[PDB]
Amino acid sequence: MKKLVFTFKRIDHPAQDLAVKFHGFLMEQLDSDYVDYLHQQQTNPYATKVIQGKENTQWVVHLLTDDHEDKVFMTLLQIKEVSLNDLPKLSVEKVEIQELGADKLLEIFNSEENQTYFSIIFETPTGFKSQGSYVIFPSMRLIFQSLMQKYGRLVENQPEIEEDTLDYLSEHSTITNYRLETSYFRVRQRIPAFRGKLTFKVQGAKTLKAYVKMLLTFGEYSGLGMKTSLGMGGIKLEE
């Protein structure tokens, strides 16, 4: 999987609305026939983010599958100038490239440092769709389910996940600390979501805790929950 970070001179505009606009610009680069293909799965092979800085603005694009990477990676590198609505033509100052393959993930598993406590940071508005209406309070079952689904569909090409494992992961995980707040994401239907940081503990074998760490490490690329392609659900597993 690939992680591309486009750096612009600091853009004075509400970050959440850039993410939606950047997503539109991104679609205008791909073959329209290929775009319609992306609209026919529960999970897209890409996730985007927008991080505002003190002196810069960063557009993050995650390539999550090899097939998607094969047809898109070169195109994204050619990008030097971006033009969005109501905004002056943007110039790409830098482009960073990081990669996350099986070698790094498997390394995470057999690590000498096995974590019991895990701190998740919700950089962008994160939401879940459960039992009809939306969700404003995150739960471990919803977090693990979204990641297990995203992982199963993208790298294993399997429609459904192991419910016993989801039960097992939820029974042994418990939120201990959090600092959260509401944050609505505009797609223009306002979508309810949350933002901030939480901490949970895992009680069990080191083989279990390793799977959690891997699932979270993978999550930093795919994003967590709803509308990850539009800029939602950007997470970060702190050291």
> What number of helices (H) and strands (E) belong to the chain?
7, 14
Interface positions, 192-211, toward a second copy (CB under 8 A): 192
Q: Quick one: which of 180, 208, 210, 237 contacts a second copy (CB under 8 A)?
A: 180
Tokens of 146: 């979204």
- Whole-number minimum distance, CB 195 to a second copy, in Å? 10
Stretch that binds a second copy, among 60-68, 76-84, 98-106, 170-178 (CB under 8 A): 170-178
Q: Which of 178, 186, 187, 237 binds a second copy (CB under 8 A)?
A: 178
Q: Kindly state the DSSP code that residue 238 receives in the 8-state scheme.
A: -
Residue 237's beta-bridge partner residues? 120
Shortest spacing between CB 135 and a second copy, in angstroms: 11
Asked whether 239 and 229 are in contact (CB, 8 A), the reply is no
Least Cβ distance, residue 117 to a second copy (angstroms): 13
- 121 binding a second copy? (CB under 8 A): no
Cα pseudo-dihedral 52, 53, 57, 61, rounded to 10: -60
Q: Quick one: which of 176, 188, 238, 239 contacts a second copy (CB under 8 A)?
A: 176
Residues 6+ apart with CB under 8 A from 150: 43, 219, 222, 223, 228
Q: Based on the number of CB atoms within 10 Å of its own CB, is 189 exposed (0-12), middle (13-18) or buried (19 or more)?
A: exposed
| Cβ at position 144, least distance to a second copy in Å | 17
Q: Which CB, 200 or 218, lies closer to a second copy?
A: 200
Which residues, numbered 30-89, are part of the site for a second copy (CB under 8 A)? none
Single residue of 28, 86, 181, 239 touching a second copy by CB under 8 A: 181
Q: How far apart, in whole angstroms, are the C-alpha atoms of residue 66 and residue 77?
A: 16
Residues of this chain that interact with a second copy (CB under 8 A) are 136-137, 175-182, 192
